[PDB]
Amino acid sequence: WGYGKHNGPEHWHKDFPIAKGERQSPVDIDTHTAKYDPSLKPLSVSYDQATSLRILNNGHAFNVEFDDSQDKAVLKGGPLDGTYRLIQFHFHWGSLDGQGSEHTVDKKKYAAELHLVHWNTKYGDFGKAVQQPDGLAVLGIFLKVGSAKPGLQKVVDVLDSIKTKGKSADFTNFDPRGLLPESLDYWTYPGSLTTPPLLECVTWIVLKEPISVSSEQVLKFRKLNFNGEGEPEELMVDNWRPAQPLKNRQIKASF
Ligand SMILES: NS(=O)(=O)/N=C(\Oc1ccccc1)N1CCOCC1
Ligand SMILES: [Zn+2]
């Protein structure tokens, strides 16, 4: 699977029939249908002891991986019951600034979207968590093009070294706190992974406030390759799934 005409989102349902499921992601967030929910508790992003390990081009995106052997970087609160450990983050982005995000807001597409993936520690390990309807929590953050995001620059700086599928590099001592906007105001809804196997295990928490990144930063994302070394170059761009049917779901606002 991939993002091209012959292996892209329109084809995924043949190997992963859940692609046409009842709680697929992403979705369009219609701000006039989302309802404030005063029962939501404050979101707690606890990343002070985060332990990043490595950055990997997996042919679909680049992934910054963390040590999730212990409660070191966790998400709690909000719509969540319990504790969810950060395992990795990645981005989706476009070929041009007017597309790239997976979620949309009143049909607006942002230039890119950051996903911080967390699993529910009550299930012991990630593999067990993704067999549960509350196994994962993904914090989604939109990127727009404006001023540079200083906290993103160390990421941008290493991409030269993982240009092709299968390449990795040490990426210790990275602080993901530097990727957040000021506000933790969010929308939440039950959904899925947005990549095969498209498992319907995720509590989505999508921040309302985008972060700004510079044109130079996003241009460096677009120099990555989907292909492996020595293979013909296919630029890693437009690695986003479009909005899926909302079906019988409710999107709730924390604000
Ligand atoms: N939006 S997402 O489904 O989280 N994307 C991904 O799914 C996962 C699956 C497991 C752990 C973290 C993320 N990625 C990024 C692209 O390469 C495939 C893996
Ligand atoms: Zn993602």
Q: What CATH number corresponds to the domain at position 246?
A: 3.10.200.10
Is there a catalytic annotation at residue 103? no
8 Å CB contact between 140 and 205: yes
Q: How many domains does the chain have?
A: 1
Q: How far is the CA of 145 from the centre of ligand 1 (A)?
A: 23
Cα 191 to Cα 103, 122, 216, distances in angstroms = 11, 19, 32
Residue 168 CB partners (closer than 8 Å, separation 6+): 54, 55, 56, 57, 162
Of 121, 10, 132, 8, nearest in space to 74 by CA:
121
Integer CA distances (angstroms), 60 to 27, 107, 116, 131, 227, in order = 20, 24, 16, 23, 9
11, 57, 109, 14: which is closest to 234 by C-alpha? 57
CA of 79 to the centre of ligand 1 (A): 21
| Amino acid, res. 96 | L
Which one of 53, 115, 142, 168 would you pick to mutate in the ligand 1 pocket, going by the greatest count of ligand atoms within 8 A of its CB? 115
Q: Which residues contact 172 (CB under 8 A, 6 or more apart)?
A: 51, 52, 53, 54
Q: Determination method here?
A: X-ray
The resolution in angstroms reads 1.4
Residues with CB under 6 A from ligand 1: 58, 60-61, 88, 90, 115, 117, 138, 193-195
Tally the C-alpha atoms within 13 A of residue 254's C-alpha that lie toward its C-beta. 22
Q: Supply the range of the domain harboring residue 157.
A: 1-255
